[PDB]
Amino acid sequence: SLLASACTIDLFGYPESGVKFTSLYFQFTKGELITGTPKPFEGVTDVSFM
Amino acid sequence: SLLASACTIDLFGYPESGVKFTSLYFQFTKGELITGTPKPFEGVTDVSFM
Ligand SMILES: *[C@@H]1O[C@H](CO)[C@@H](O[C@@H]2O[C@H](CO)[C@@H](O[C@@H]3O[C@H](CO)[C@@H](O)[C@H](O)[C@@H]3O)[C@H](O)[C@H]2NC(C)=O)[C@H](O)[C@H]1NC(C)=O
Ligand SMILES: *[C@@H]1O[C@H](CO)[C@@H](O[C@@H]2O[C@H](CO)[C@@H](O[C@@H]3O[C@H](CO)[C@@H](O)[C@H](O)[C@@H]3O)[C@H](O)[C@H]2NC(C)=O)[C@H](O)[C@H]1NC(C)=O
Asked: Family per UniProt (chains A, B) (predicted)?
């Protein structure tokens, strides 16, 4: 659904005459608390590494 | 319908309280192959002229 102050990602299909499947609205703000990691961590007491 | 990566031309009417009749979505890329000429050519073996 539409969120205030959000950007949109439009998902399309070409079935073989394309259609729009859905519109994903992303509402977000910047900072450190939430991180989009590629996967869950396992056996991890401290997520950070280097 | 909506096309991915397309521009829109909105067609409106004022009937005498206006309405939008339709939205035309244009999906295109640049180059030489397809040309929007004003009309068909007749008796033409070579479309180009100068
Ligand atoms: C930032 O500094 C902290 C503190 O030194 C680093 O955390 C330390 O990370 C090491 C390596 O994972 C931990 O050692 C581990 O201890 C556990 C038992 O608790 C053991 O099972 C593992 O084999 C390993 O020896 C250490 O506990 C941990 N120290 C603390 C107090 O957090 C951290 O790694 C640094 N940041 C980054 C980028 O990793
Ligand atoms: C780019 O150069 C080509 C090649 O010279 C030009 O094409 C030539 O155009 C002339 C004029 O239309 C053609 O002459 C015509 O011949 C037909 C019979 O085939 C005849 O019925 C007409 O009365 C006229 O005499 C000629 O055939 C044609 N040559 C070839 C091989 O394409 C062309 O005009 C040039 N590009 C542009 C911008 O026109």
From this structure: Belongs to the alphacoronaviruses spike protein family.
